[PDB]
Design a protein around this ligand. Sequence first.
Ligand SMILES: [K+]
Ligand SMILES: [K+]
Ligand SMILES: [K+]
Ligand SMILES: [Mg+2]
Ligand SMILES: [Mg+2]
Ligand SMILES: [Mg+2]
Ligand SMILES: [Mg+2]
Ligand SMILES: [Mg+2]
Ligand SMILES: [Mg+2]
Ligand SMILES: [Mg+2]
Ligand SMILES: [Mg+2]
Lengths: 224, 253, 254, 260, 372, 88
Amino acid sequence: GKGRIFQAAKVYQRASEAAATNIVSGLPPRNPPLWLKAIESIPPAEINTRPYPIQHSPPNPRARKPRNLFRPTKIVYPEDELRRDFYRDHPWELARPRMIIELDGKDARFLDWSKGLRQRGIPLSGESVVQRQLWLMENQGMTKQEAYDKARHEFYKLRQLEQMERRIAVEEARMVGGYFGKDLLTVGMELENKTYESWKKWATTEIARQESARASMYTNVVDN
Amino acid sequence: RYIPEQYLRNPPSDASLEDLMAAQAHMGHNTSLWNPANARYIYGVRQGIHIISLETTATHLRRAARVVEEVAYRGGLILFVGTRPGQRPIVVRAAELAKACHLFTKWRPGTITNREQLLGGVPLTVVDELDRPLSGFEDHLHDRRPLAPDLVVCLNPKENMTLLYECSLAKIPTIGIIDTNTNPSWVTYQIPANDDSLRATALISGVLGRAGERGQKRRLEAAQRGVVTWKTPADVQGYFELASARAADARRR
Amino acid sequence: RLAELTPRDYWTIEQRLSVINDTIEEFSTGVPYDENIEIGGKIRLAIDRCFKYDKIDEIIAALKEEAAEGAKGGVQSWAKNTLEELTQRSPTSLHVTLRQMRLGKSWGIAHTFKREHQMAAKFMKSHDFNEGVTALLIDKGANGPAKWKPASLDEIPPGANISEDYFRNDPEVPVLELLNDRSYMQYPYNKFGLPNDYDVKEAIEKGNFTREKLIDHFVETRRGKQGVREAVSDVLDRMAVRSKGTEHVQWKKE
Amino acid sequence: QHYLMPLRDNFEQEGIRNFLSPGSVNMAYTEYQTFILEKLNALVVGTDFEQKDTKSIVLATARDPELAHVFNHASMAHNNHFFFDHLSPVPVKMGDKLFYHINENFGSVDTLRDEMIGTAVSMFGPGFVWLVRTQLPGQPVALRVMATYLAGSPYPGAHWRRQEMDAQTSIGSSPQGLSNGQRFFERSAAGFKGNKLEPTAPGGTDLIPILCLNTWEYAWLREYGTGVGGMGGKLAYAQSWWNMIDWAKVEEEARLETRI
Amino acid sequence: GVSPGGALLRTSRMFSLPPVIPPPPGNKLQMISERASATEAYPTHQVLTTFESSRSRGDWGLKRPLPLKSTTGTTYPMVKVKEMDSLEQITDFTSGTQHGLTLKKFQALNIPISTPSEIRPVQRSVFEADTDVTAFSPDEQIQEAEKRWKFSGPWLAGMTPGEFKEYLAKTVRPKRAEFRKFIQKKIAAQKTEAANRELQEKPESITDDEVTEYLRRLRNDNQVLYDLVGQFLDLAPLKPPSPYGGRGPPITHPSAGISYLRTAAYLNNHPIYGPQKSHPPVQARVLKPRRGNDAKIGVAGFVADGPLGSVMDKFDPSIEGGAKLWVNVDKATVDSTGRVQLTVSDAKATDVLIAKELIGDAREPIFGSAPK
Amino acid sequence: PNKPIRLPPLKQLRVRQANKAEENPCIAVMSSVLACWASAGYNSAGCATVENALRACMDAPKPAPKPNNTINYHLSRFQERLTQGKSK
RNA sequence: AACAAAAAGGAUUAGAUACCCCAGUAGUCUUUGCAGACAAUUAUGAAUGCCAUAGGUUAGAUUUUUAAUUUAGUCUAUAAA
RNA sequence: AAUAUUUUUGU
Ligand SMILES: [K+]
Ligand SMILES: [K+]
Ligand SMILES: [K+]
Ligand SMILES: [Mg+2]
Ligand SMILES: [Mg+2]
Ligand SMILES: [Mg+2]
Ligand SMILES: [Mg+2]
Ligand SMILES: [Mg+2]
Ligand SMILES: [Mg+2]
Ligand SMILES: [Mg+2]
Ligand SMILES: [Mg+2]
């Protein structure tokens, strides 16, 4: 028994009895702690009582002696199957960074998926395609594939314009005397040079080191 | 609609489900590392972790705020304890609002059960209804034994169990943030939430900090009307009786 | 949670209701963010301007003015919908209904049941009840809509006072014997809901709060109950005049 | 999300009496600015610039060759409002200090009047004409005129997109062409390599744009029309603009040192 | 029926994380390294970002705040979370720039992705209503199956002998009953042909005799049979008697969601010189020289074959930073396994010198000084 | 093949010798000298160049001790997390 | 064949039947019987019902066969006890 | 890495 008897839930019951009477028989009990009356009407909650957890999926009806009746179940939605299909068809869509840090939690209040892929507050990513697909598939009664094609093609027409802006925006700026810094292609190559040079130092050092091992195999200390 | 240092400059009076979710107050620990005792606050399982119910976190948080408020309304000494690398600004800010004590380092074992030795030379002071000091208790502040918090608010109960045990051993109420892997029987009022997140702790501390502030306001506002919400503690009460006894001798003699 | 609460035997009923009031407010997930007060502002003002008379003839007359295009109330759509429903109910019940709304403001809780029993006892003999129920529940709307004994309120002449026989207890029907003698004129504990005009009035008449400083006074006393900021603001948008500016606020009735 | 903000003195509902009818100011700011913000919001919908200010985006996305398109909207939404804000409801008398200082840098108010107006028409393109405040570490507060193209930032921190000279009709084989060409290459090479061409004080205090003039097509193409036959047009637009300059605010934003 | 707390989680941002897709397919019967793994062909985890104000605190919207040592200092904040909370009670993460910037490099080349071509270059876009389609109906015959790219059945020539056995026994064998019905629907249509044609100038078809006999007539012509079996299982055509099925269909979208451009038929207008002939060159590394019967070069993070022609002949330790040569990316496509193969073609001389003019590396500037 | 097991609860997760044990270099030169004498001879000339190297080794100053390895400290931080726990 | 109680020799040792060594018969193995004692051990009889988790592992099953559920065993570390 | 001489007693 490595545990200890924690009586944190009975601090009131214990303190209420110790303050009811006085140790010195024949005198009135002294004033109780200042906290005894503050939580007089705020009892603790019931702890350590395993309930039947919420079932997020229909439990196996064929099981006659089911186990894990007090185990929280996995939360699975209809979108999980769509996210896996999309991101697998567009693996490099994961390279596009996406922030999962919420600002105030009120993001699903301005999302009306009957308008289109572009919504307020969230970026155009594989989720917008999934939420748009789920809407058409349910409301418009489209099949998984039909809704997928429609919502998928709207995603491309919006991404194409994004890549065209970067090219034209730069070309347009130089036509009026606008210069920029080092592009990502150049910066990436310079970093490889600094690393390749460090590898060259490691190669020449080990190569020379192996020569000693090859010469140390045979013995020539006599100097014939 | 979100600034990192917003829970300190202006914490909210009450936390909604949107605030708690945005602050990652529902991210439990890995399913493998769980305490089945606190399977009552878990909503499900996702990303390999347990998801704490956003409704259970709000109902327990609103209850603790009512506890921190009343204890401050009755002139109680509160203690906000958060001992983690970045939990110092949070605890100190909460204490300022609630006019309480802070603790952001390792709790020295025995500061409650062995307070006579540890808190020996620390100075005290006697204040009246309106928190203004009283003169004449010089001889009482030399024999009086050190104080103990009337309510502890731990932001990481899993780390410091020596503090929570001294509270249960000394009959002191406690409030803690019970993560999925924390034993819920260590405190009196649990707050199921993610204690590993620095953004969820600042929100809880702000709510509890504002609760104390709102409690101290009522207490002091009632004192101006000649309505004291508390009576002299037993320790100071005994000193009064001895004072009259010594004063009686002067009257006769 | 209500089961975990174990009050002391020496606690007054006021303490018991306060402990349960604070326990219910802990499970509040917040009112909707988009839904606005339905009966508030314009529609709420129209209700007070068209239902203050003691005769249904005047009430409908007032509504006709609101429904008339060009009125300043702005409830043309609502007033029109209200009339379409008032001309589809038994004209006898309307007279009797409005009659007791003015009398019920002085009856006691126990006196109400005794009067309602003698009142509901005479409705069983009436022709409208036995007709409306059969024509709407048993027949399920079949055979057309209900056919009240008086075709419409227009048939009832102004001098008619049909709302006078349903308030005369007969000796045949024994007086209702209640299980106890407890009674009261006003509810003893009915101030746990949102603050209505009565509460806002009491605060204004006992303080020097401003437009914005008065709303905060309620968010504190009510421990930030959900919907207090939206309810108090509405009351201060119908019966609150900015007479002295942002310094203070007064009521419109004066 | 970035949202539109009301104008200075209710120009949206009423508009300047003798400069821009309410219908023109409606299409110039309430409709166009809304269009730019709708595009800007979609670009920074999920980036760090979701809560940053237009100026903060202008300086942050000035040199980035991959965020040039984000700079245009951010720089356009800023310069557009910077122009309408300075407009006054009624004519304002030029301040003594400002009037006296202008004569020291341009000789007379009429000289600066025809310079900015002339520079606008001589550009034959959309952009902005600025009245900059040049103050070096030791030199006095000297003013000058700078003409930016479609979306150019007069701030020193955004020198990467100043866009002063057109590279189509300013770089050729003539003596002036070669000189301009060398500068175009000297800047690009230096900017790319990171070298600083002209030293600048920290905090971007060298240049402080005081006044602006939006010469884009949408601003005046409706009020003053094309301008065939000299009646109206871009020229009249610039001239009429000279009568609604809030010289009081222009003087305040100048912050001229006490030298009188 | 879902509680309000459960409704916010469904729409939360952390719940939107996509599951970890399987890694890029490799050779099943081969050897690999276990104690060390390099960058993958395409990303498998989602790359995350955070506000610069939240990065100074380590807050990335995860279980716990990340350390500031390996998370701050870099320009582009990117990270991949393999496990939000491992058995060590720590968020197992790693820098995501390996794939986050590789996408930005490729998108900086401004080249689309076109369907593979067998060896008259015809660069057809990938996103088109005729080819880029996944939904279909039982009316489309084989002539339309060549356009599709997402099939439900596997590629037979690719599956291993064991993977093929599992398919025949557990996916094909328990379908005879349903397939016999598929034939009946066809036979029902054939009988309607003669009736319709004769009327201008359907029968239920539920009869085991016709179905069983209809299959005996196709034994002599096994070709027409395969077309019927593939339509029931949605198999990728293999024999020409066509849709570039020599190597098999793609395991993903033909573009892999890396570049959504459709055409490269444009001319970047240079400020001074004007419209150029070809696209600007890109400097490429030299890896694994010939002296392997082929040389590898690193073009924007990707590895591709060198141009069909020094730097490619022999290794030169003296060259600082390694051998680097300018080159033009001609064509880019995604093979069956998902790799991004580039058809790197040698670049011209004038283009390189022109690209350096805006950089300051050109020895002699082409403008002004150039006399001829 | 199975994967590495989860170690049982230990008293302390550490390595006996954190920093490698340095071997005296001159001991290796002596072995080469003893090799010449075995094959060539003692009062010979082939061991001249090898005997000189042995004298130069003992004359040279020994290296300085390397900074201790901090492996055992980090092992103690992740013990309870990596293993089943701490036992005592 | 090999190993090896016994018997026998050589050493060690204050003495050495011994431990070590040179050799070595029963016996070990095959077939047919007798014999029934074992730390024949999990120092824990067999069996039924029931009690919260985690990390490995064995033979299967199912599946959105990637990786998670699941039946019957076995083994470590724990909770309540 | 596969190393191994002996060494009793204490009212
Ligand atoms: K032997
Ligand atoms: K036997
Ligand atoms: K097991
Ligand atoms: Mg924790
Ligand atoms: Mg012997
Ligand atoms: Mg045997
Ligand atoms: Mg045995
Ligand atoms: Mg037995
Ligand atoms: Mg076994
Ligand atoms: Mg065990
Ligand atoms: Mg002895």
